[PDB]
Copies of this chain bind each other. A is one copy, B any other.
Amino acid sequence: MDVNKAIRTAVDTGKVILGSKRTIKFVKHGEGKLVVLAGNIPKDLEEDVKYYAKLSNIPVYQHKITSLELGAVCGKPFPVAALLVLDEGLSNIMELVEKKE
């Protein structure tokens, strides 16, 4: 609930890249502050994003909700298997993730 609120806030007040393909592309280029993955993200994409994120020291938060659920959290009617926060805006998502438990 807290994380989902933080994600929506980042999307509406900051800058968030939506989609697994786009997320990987941005992270590969070293851009981004935080990666959030849906619980049903394809394993290969999951490993790709974690590999590139690791290379640029970008944290990755593994969510439990589905890609369609994550899309809805972002206020979208389409699935989002992964997203990348470029700018957290007024969100506290960065801090929430830091003590993720």
Contacts and interface: CB of A to CB of B under 8 A. Distances in A.
Interface of A: 37, 39-46, 66
Count the copies: 2
A interface majority secondary structure: mixed
Contacts of A66: 44
14 contacts: A37-B43, A39-B43, A39-B44, A40-B42, A40-B43, A40-B44, A40-B45, A41-B42, A41-B43, A42-B42, A42-B43, A43-B43, A43-B46, A44-B66
A45 B66 CA distance: 11
A-B pairs, 7 with minimum CB distance: A40-B42, A40-B44, A39-B44, A41-B43, A43-B46, A43-B43, A42-B42
